[PDB]
């Protein structure tokens, strides 16, 4: 009645929704790698290298928790690339790397995918595709020094610009005009290298900068950094809502057939959906359906006449989810009848239903005709003896309504 | 010397299983039927590197032991060493340089440590980040590749961290390998039953990989296919305008100590130079900077007809109205830009200029 | 450069014609697609992959779920209209008799036969051998079955040998089947006898021409191009569909729940709303091209319809419409998603070149044939009917009169005898 | 139930037609669906962004009515040419065609108009009371054999 | 012809050759229709002189 947005509705059989095999429980399964990342090793670090020569430690091998960073007051500037920092202590990573130098802060806005600028020139290039967080901070209380601190470099001249990634210690003179340089300084001719002198009383934009910068591993390949995110039983043959480090999803968890080989994380399919997992507790391949859907097609007598009613699950066998079950899908509150009438309200594979006394809508093997045997002989001939006229109709449609559709009235009112 | 790679340039493109299933994957691979070089223990030469390499070495007994990457290999700027015993490896990225005609008797930065069959132990760069893949194979002609197809059974596939143009493999001292660069290429893989890799296709080898990999397909039905279209890239670049070599005033200008009441804007004209736009868009002074119909970071690539630098005071609150399609005082009665605005804005606070000592 | 034929010229002149001597009853094979697959999709589980979080930004493109679905169910709706109008125009499912006295025509290649385990007849469970997810698409199955298809097809053919074309007409008057040969060679003006004085060998010819079809079928892959093709085109469709879920259309993932996972609701949802954008293009064009090519099948379907009516429940004026020839009957036989018709069809055969004259001047009245042509041997003259040589002697009964000689251009002397 | 074709000629129309209306009061994504909302709480340059889309959805909206459209206008001239066909042959002539102009044999026609269509009447001869008959297909009389004419 | 745009339109999978196999299918069909209206004659049939 809804779907049709009407109460009175015609005799037939119509479509209202989708139906799903709903969920029963969550699932969530992360590798059991109980020890501590060591952020204080990065953040709260002793001494911090230069911009010209930033320093990258891995991450590896362990449980760690972001929030712990991104709710704190520390922190002058936190922008993240290809994911969310609200949402980190939900995913899992092949590794984390954290890259570390100090700037000065008018030089923060270079730490950015892709960027220009005597930095992002020719000190820290970062990726174009970037996926990670870029963590930036004034330390003026630790890094700056009456007198200047001369501790820090950057590298002012370069011959081209540095691929992502690209990384340079070397301390040639640049050569700035047609004079060559031959290993000494001059005129056209000068160190690579600046020094920041920072002076505690300087400007804050020219004040010292740590930042930290996290590059995510985060690849569908094995995993050995995961947020603090606990882990459940396993289920198979059911389903259920689920999650494997940190790819979500909700299926029929099932045992498999695969082998994959030693490298491969997640199996897909041809719509690059996930159709397998190796459990990362278990190493065992686990394989993936959705959980078994159709069309809910509703068969009814005209609302009128009753209000008795019955409903094809198309497809579907009713094992997957009066009632019975056909090639057309499994059909409930339909009657099954051995006579065979014609064909009211079709519903597939020679079946039809229709609504009879004990009252309930009927299902039956359709009738193709009345059977009759012709009295051939090859002697035999059969010749009218009368004739009735008759007067067929037949109806043709010939045209339909003009309208024509101003296009900009319709758009732009 | 050369010798015909034939198909053997494959490796699984991505840590995913697919099985029963053709896939359409671009990426650096050794195109098929190209030219590999060839040599033989009597030799090491340095090489270059070019976007990546596939390297392949039949030999009896671990004869081969590892290689050298670098730019220079002289300790004026980094290079990548490794060492292996089969795949158990040693590496090191550093200044370092071992003796200048490498081989084993039988400052760094990063550091990780782990015929019936001639082997097919076979290698390949991107970037700095070795794939290693394996196969036995029986053998009778030691000069060349075998023809039979087969991304191998797969060994090590790690990323690092560094920078390479050049390289040189390592030998035992008290053989036969194969050198081929990798190009861009689109191919089509395919996986069996069992997700391993049993054949593909070099959509750049001939018109018909090119209809194969057209269609989505190993095999073709009789008929005509449409597939591609003659076209041709530019071959060289020409420039041209009438030529200068003046360095434009933006350096005087911009530290220029007097300024201009809005109602009457200066269009101080600009023409006629070579310019830099980096030295104004990282200038931190500018309280704010915008573009229109340009990017600031693409500035230092283009060309003019005329420049011109409307300039002007006004009051903190105003900066809003400085851009196409504005509204308010100033835009609307003191400087109107256009709906379809070309060129920066380029502001900053002047508290410490214009509001003057006693007030102005 | 292609070759458009063989090079001939007709030996035309003013007096010259050819009659033919004998004929070969021709048998001929005709396919149609009928129906096609009814796929039908649910949008929403195409478009969201059951995300609540996508199908409440769905609801802000509004009905075209709606219409969508409503669309690709006219087109599968439909596909149980054609059928039942190409197929079932019988109104009584007819039987043969048990034994097979057709007069000489050996008909067990094409009635069915129970002794199979779908009760086809030899050529439909031959042709039956010729012809060859989970993202919310479905395939629906037809109305009716190939075993209710193939009873059609046999109560259209069994009406057929033992009725003829008065089933159409309205009953099934009984008639022995060389008569029923009889009169439909006297529609196309092959004097009857022709049959009966010949009726072995028409039986021999008829015979062989249904076996070479069997061998033609047992051997020929490209036979059933028209059928595959419609099947082909489904696939084809459907395969495109479904490898349009992995493209990124500029979004940061092609997968859903990898957004989902990695962003927070406002960074998610512009990713969301442009991967929505490419999956509804994607849908709305496999709707529009599937519209098409139903209307496209329609046009199939209701050709089907008129040579069912006009080739099988009767016998046809109109050239080469039921296959080329002369058209004496045809025999309907079902095929996957189409329908195949045997037309058999008299083709005349060994000419003979005569003299001929338009008119005979007797007792200075003019005389023409009533039926058929005055002919030559060369020193006799005889009146034949058009379309097979028989030389009757030329009287005052086989022709008639209509004034003097002089009028006609070409006309001959020659006595007409007076029986 | 008995001018069927003919309703759903005139039913498929006025239901897109209320399809293509109704798609007015969707949102497209922006942050309203009714036009002055967006030229009224936003800023030129962040209305024009919103509108853009209210133009995307519209037009695509409009494109589908019209495709539609086309593709039933298709199916009207093919039925359009079967009429004045069954004018031509059913009405003007006698038909031999089997079941063309009604079943039964077809002895005439009459057009009778309608809304959007014909209909016509075909009056057909049907043969009844059969009798059966013993039958052969030729006499032999003096050694001769005669068929019938 | 530019790169750039070439790999941005990758990224909507297969309208851009899903297209060519619509248009070349129109194409093929006009060869068919001239095909069947003409070609229904076997041979190469030409007249007498006079
Ligand atoms: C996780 O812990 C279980 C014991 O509770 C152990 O069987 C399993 O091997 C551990 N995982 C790994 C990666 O070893
Ligand atoms: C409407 O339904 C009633 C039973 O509810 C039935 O008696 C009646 O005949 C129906 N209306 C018509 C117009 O037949
Ligand atoms: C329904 O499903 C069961 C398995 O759950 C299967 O064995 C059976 O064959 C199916 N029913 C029919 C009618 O095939
Ligand atoms: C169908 O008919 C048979 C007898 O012919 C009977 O045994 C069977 O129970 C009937 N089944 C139904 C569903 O009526
Ligand atoms: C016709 O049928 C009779 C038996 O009723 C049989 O004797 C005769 O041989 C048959 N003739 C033919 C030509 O079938
Ligand atoms: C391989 O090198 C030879 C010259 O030694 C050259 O003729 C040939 O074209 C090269 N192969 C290819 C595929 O170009
Ligand atoms: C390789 O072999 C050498 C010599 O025995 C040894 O010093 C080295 O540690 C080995 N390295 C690995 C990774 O096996
Ligand atoms: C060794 O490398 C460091 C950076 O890792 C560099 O600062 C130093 O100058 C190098 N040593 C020498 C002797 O130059
Ligand atoms: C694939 O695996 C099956 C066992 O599951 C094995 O029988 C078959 O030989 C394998 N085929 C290949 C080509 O790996
Ligand atoms: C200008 O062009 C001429 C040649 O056309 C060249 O000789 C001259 O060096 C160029 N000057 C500059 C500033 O590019
Ligand atoms: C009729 O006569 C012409 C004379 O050139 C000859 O070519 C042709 O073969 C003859 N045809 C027959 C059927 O005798
Ligand atoms: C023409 O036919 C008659 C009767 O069959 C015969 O007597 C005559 O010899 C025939 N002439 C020729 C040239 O065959
Ligand atoms: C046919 O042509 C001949 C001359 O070749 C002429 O004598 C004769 O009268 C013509 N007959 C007709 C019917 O044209
Ligand atoms: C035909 O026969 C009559 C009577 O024998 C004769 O007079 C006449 O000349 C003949 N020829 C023609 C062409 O009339
Ligand atoms: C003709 O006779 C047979 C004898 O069995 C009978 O079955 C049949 O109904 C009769 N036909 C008519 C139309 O009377």
Not at chain 1, 317 to 331: D, K, M
Not at chain 2, 88 to 113: A, H, M, R, S
Request: charged share 15%; glycine share 6%.
């Amino acid at each position: 009645k809804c779907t049709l947005k009407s109460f009175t509705v015609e005799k037939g059989i119509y479509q209202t929704s989708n139906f799903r095999v709903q969920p029963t429980e969550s699932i969530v399964r992360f590798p059991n790698i109980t020890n501590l990342c060591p952020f204080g090793e990065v953040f709260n670090a002793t001494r911090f290298a230069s911009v010209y020569a930033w320093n990258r430690k891995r991450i590896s091998n362990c449980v760690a928790d972001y929030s712990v960073l991104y709710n704190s007051a520390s922190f002058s500037t936190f922008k993240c690339y290809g994911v969310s920092p609200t949402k980190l202590n939900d995913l899992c990573f092949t590794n984390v790397y954290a890259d570390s130098f100090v700037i000065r802060g008018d030089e923060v806005r270079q730490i950015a995918p892709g960027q220009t600028g005597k930095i992002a020139d020719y000190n820290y290039k970062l990726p174009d595709d970037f996926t990670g967080c870029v963590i930036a901070w004034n330390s003026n209380n630790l890094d700056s020094k009456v007198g200047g601190n001369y501790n820090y470099l950057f590298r002012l001249f370069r011959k081209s610009n540095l691929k992502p990634f690209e990384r340079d210690i070397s301390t040639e003179i640049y050569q700035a005009g047609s004079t060559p340089c031959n290993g000494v300084e001059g005129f056209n001719c000068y160190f690579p290298l600046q020094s920041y002198g920072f002076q505690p009383t300087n400007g804050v934009g020219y004040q010292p900068y740590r930042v930290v910068v996290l590059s995510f591993e985060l690849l569908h390949a094995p995993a050995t950094v995961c947020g603090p995110k606990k882990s459940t039983n396993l289920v198979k043959n059911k389903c259920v809502n689920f999650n494997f480090n940190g790819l979500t999803g909700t299926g029929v968890l099932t045992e498999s057939n695969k082998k994959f080989l030693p490298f491969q994380q997640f199996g897909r399919d041809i719509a690059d959906t996930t159709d397998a997992v190796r459990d990362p507790q278990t190493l065992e391949i686990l394989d993936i359906t959705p959980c078994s859907f159709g069309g809910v097609s509703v068969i009814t007598p005209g609302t009128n006449t009753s209000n008795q009613v019955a409903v094809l699950y198309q497809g579907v066998n009713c094992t997957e989810v009066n009632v019975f079950q056909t090639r057309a899908g499994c059909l409930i509150g339909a009657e099954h009848v051995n006579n065979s009438y014609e064909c009211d309200i079709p519903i597939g594979a020679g079946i039809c239903a229709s609504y009879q006394t004990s009252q309930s809508v009927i299902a039956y093997t359709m009738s193709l005709g009345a059977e009759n045997s012709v009295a051939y002989s090859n002697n035999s001939i059969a010749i009218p003896t009368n004739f009735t006229i008759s007067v067929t109709t037949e109806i043709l449609p010939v045209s339909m309504t003009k309208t024509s559709v101003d296009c900009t009235m319709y758009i732009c009112g | 010397a050369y010798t015909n790679s034939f198909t053997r340039g494959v490796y699984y493109p991505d840590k995913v299983f697919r099985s029963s299933v053709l896939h359409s994957t671009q990426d650096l691979f050794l195109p098929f039927f190209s030219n590999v070089t060839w040599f033989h223990a009597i030799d090491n030469p340095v090489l270059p590197f070019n976007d990546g390499v596939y390297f392949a070495s039949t030999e009896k007994s671990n004869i081969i032991r590892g290689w050298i990457f670098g730019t220079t290999l002289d300790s004026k700027t980094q290079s990548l060493l490794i060492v292996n015993n089969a795949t158990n490896v040693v590496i090191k990225v550093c200044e370092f340089q071992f003796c200048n005609d490498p081989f084993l008797g039988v400052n760094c930065t990063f550091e990780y440590v782990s015929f019936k069959n001639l082997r097919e132990f076979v290698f390949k760069n991107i970037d700095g980040y070795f794939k290693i893949y394996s196969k036995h194979t029986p053998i009778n002609l030691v000069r060349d590749l075998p023809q039979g197809f087969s991304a191998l059974e797969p060994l090590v596939d790690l990323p690092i961290g560094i920078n390479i143009t050049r390289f040189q493999t390592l030998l035992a001292l008290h053989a036969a390998y194969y050198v081929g660069y990798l190009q861009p290429r689109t191919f089509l893989l395919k996986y069996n039953e069992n997700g391993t890799i049993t054949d593909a296709v070099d959509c750049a080898l001939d018109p018909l990989s090119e209809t194969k990999c057209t269609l989505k397909s190993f095999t073709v039905e009789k008929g005509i296919y449409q597939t591609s279209n003659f076209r041709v890239q530019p071959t060289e670049s020409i420039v041209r305008f009438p030529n200068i070599t003046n360095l434009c005033p933006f350096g005087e200008v911009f530290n220029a100590t007097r300024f201009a009441s809005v109602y009457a804007w200066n269009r101080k004209r600009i023409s006629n130079c070579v310019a830099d736009y980096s030295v104004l868009y990282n200038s931190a002074s500018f309280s704010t900077f915008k573009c229109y119909g340009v990017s600031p970071t693409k500035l230092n690539d283009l060309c003019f007809t005329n420049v011109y630098a409307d300039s002007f005071v006004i009051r903190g609150d105003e900066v809003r109205q400085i851009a196409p399609g504005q509204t308010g005082k100033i835009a609307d009665y003191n400087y109107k830009l256009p709906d379809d605005f070309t060129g920066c804005v380029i502001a900053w606070n002047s508290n410490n200029l214009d509001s003057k000592v006693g007030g102005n | 450069t292609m070759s458009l034929g063989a090079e001939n010229s007709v030996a035309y002149s003013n007096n010259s014609i050819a009659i033919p001597t004998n004929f070969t009853i021709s048998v001929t094979t005709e396919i149609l697609p009928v129906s096609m697959t009814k796929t039908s999709v649910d949008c929403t589980m195409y478009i969201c992959g059951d995300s609540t979080e996508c199908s409440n930004l769905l609801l802000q493109y509004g009905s075209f779920c709606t219409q969508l679905n409503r669309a690709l169910t006219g087109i599968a709706v439909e596909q149980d209209k054609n059928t039942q109008e190409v197929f079932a125009q019988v109104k009584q499912i007819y039987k043969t008799p048990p034994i097979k006295d057709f007069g000489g025509f050996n008909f067990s290649q094409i009635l069915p036969d129970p002794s199979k385990p779908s009760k086809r007849s030899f050529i439909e469970d031959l042709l039956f051998n010729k012809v060859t997810k989970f993202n919310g698409l479905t395939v629906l199955p037809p109305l009716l079955t190939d075993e209710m298809i193939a009873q059609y097809t046999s109560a259209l053919l069994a009406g057929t040998i033992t009725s003829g074309w008065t089933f159409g007409a309205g009953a099934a008057l009984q008639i022995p089947f060389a008569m029923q040969m009889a009169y439909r060679f006297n529609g196309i003006g092959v004097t009857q006898n022709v049959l009966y004085e010949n009726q072995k060998l028409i039986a021999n010819q008829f015979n062989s021409a249904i076996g070479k079809i069997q061998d033609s079928l047992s051997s020929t892959a490209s036979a059933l191009g028209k059928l595959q093709d419609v099947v082909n085109q489904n696939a084809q469709a459907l395969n495109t569909l479904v490898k349009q879920l992995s493209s990124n259309f500029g979004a940061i993932s092609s997968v859903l729940n990898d957004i989902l996972s990695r962003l927070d609701k406002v960074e998610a949802e512009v990713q969301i709303d442009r991967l929505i954008t490419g999956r509804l293009q994607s849908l709305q064009t496999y709707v529009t091209q599937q519209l098409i090519r139903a209307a496209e099948i329609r046009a199939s379907a209701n050709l089907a319809a008129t040579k069912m009516s006009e080739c099988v429940l009767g016998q046809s004026k109109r050239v080469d419409f039921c296959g080329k020839g002369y058209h004496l009957m045809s025999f309907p036989q079902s095929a996957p998603h189409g329908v195949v018709f045997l037309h058999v069809t008299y083709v005349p055969a060994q000419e003979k070149n005569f003299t001929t004259a338009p008119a005979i001047c007797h007792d200075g009245k003019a005389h023409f044939p009533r039926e058929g042509v005055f002919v030559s041997n060369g020193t006799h003259w005889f009146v034949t009917q058009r379309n097979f040589y028989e030389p009757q002697i030329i009287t005052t009964d086989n022709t008639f009169v209509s004034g003097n000689c002089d009028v006609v251009i070409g006309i001959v002397n020659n006595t007409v005898y007076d029986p």
